[PDB]
């Protein structure tokens, strides 16, 4: 599969990818707006959040849609937009870079093709050297996030030593992760449910997408204890939980994880002193997608499907 091949590059490749091309990054207002459709929308969020937390300017992720057709309430005098498209043709990232151009803000192209509309017609195109091309994006949602995390941190003239330490420990997290989550009985587990705050509710978006697109089942992403509040009424065994731990809240994970399973779910912790450790600082953004997008995988195999061949899905969305 093309797909579990690139799904596998997060470990192969990262280390090259990070040393080429993230590395050499720094030899890019008051409001900065992040701007895409499906999982560019939700690594638009993502990387929002981390803006918005080490550079404290005000942020907005905005679908491209209510941009291209001018619905999203109106915006500042003038700014910076991030627009993402992997593909580059996204009609509504086009349309939305025009309505943005038209409106005093400045552009910047994130795709990974060179010859498209988006590198063409964005004021400030940033091409990722990244090869990706399944239908599912996997690799392309870290890569770009890691580098947009590594940037914001340049600027804002924080350490950026600590991305090197988590891009060195993506082989050992992607083999725990696979191994781990092998031991799931996936065909007893039909509803899939992620959780996490902040930059990690983000990721949890991308890994219901992840899971919904690959393996066709039903998966959704809450704020962590918001997940109280009313959606738990759907637990029943069947229902897996994977939730994405943050510094300092062990006891609130915890308390969650028991009440959950109490009440029939089967609940898997990404992070440190969970099932699946990573550093619980923001900064391992950039690789936990990497579980979900295992599990999506994984899940697809057990229904008997192929992860490659989304139903009615295309590459490049266009209106």
């Known amino acids: 599969s093309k797909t579990l091949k690139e799904i596998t590059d997060q470990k192969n490749e990262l ?9 050499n990054l720094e030899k890019i207002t008051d409001e900065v707006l992040f701007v895409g459709c499906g999982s560019s929308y ?47 043709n996204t009609t509504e ?18 795709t990974i093709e060179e010859e498209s509309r988006l590198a063409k017609e964005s004021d400030l195109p940033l091409v990722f050297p990244v090869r990706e091309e399944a239908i599912v994006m996997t690799k392309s949602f870290s890569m770009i996030l ?17 991305f090197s330490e988590l891009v ?15 031991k ?10 992620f959780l996490g705050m902040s930059e ?5 978006l991308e890994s219901a997408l992840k899971c919904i697109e690959m393996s066709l089942t039903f998966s959704e992403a809450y704020s962590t204890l918001e997940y109280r509040h009313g959606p738990k009424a759907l637990v029943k065994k ?5 939730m994405q731990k943050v510094s300092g809240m062990d006891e609130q994970e915890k308390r969650l994880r028991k009440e959950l399973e109490s009440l029939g779910a089967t609940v898997l912790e990404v992070g440190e002193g969970g099932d699946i450790p990573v550093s619980n600082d923001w900064k391992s953004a950039f690789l936990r997608t990497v579980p979900a997008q295992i599990l999506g995988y994984q899940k697809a195999i057990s229904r008997g499907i192929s992860p490659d061949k989304p139903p009615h899905l295309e590459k490049t969305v266009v209106l």
Do not use: C
Not at 184 to 193: P, Q, R, T, Y
């Open 168 to 182: 060195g420990y993506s082989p050992e997290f992607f083999d725990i992760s696979w191994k781990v989550i092998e």
């Open 146 to 162: 890691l580098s947009l995390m590594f940037l914001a941190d340049k600027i804002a003239g924080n350490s950026t030593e600590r």
């Open 93 to 110: 990232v086009l349309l939305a870079n025009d309505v943005l151009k038209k409106r005093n803000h400045r552009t910047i192209g994130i």
């Open 200 to 204: 990690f509710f983000g990721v949890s």
């Open 15 to 23: 280390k090259k990818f990070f040393e080429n091309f993230v590395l």
């Open 42 to 88: 939700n690594l638009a969020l993502t990387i929002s959040y981390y803006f918005e937390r080490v550079l404290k300017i005000r942020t907005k992720a905005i679908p491209a849609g209510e941009v291209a057709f001018q619905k999203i309430p109106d915006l500042e005098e003038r700014g910076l937009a991030f627009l993402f498209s992997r593909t580059g």
């Open 238 to 242: 069947g229902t897996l939980v994977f």
């Open 184 to 193: 799931i009985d996936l065909k007893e587990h039909d509803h899939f449910v």
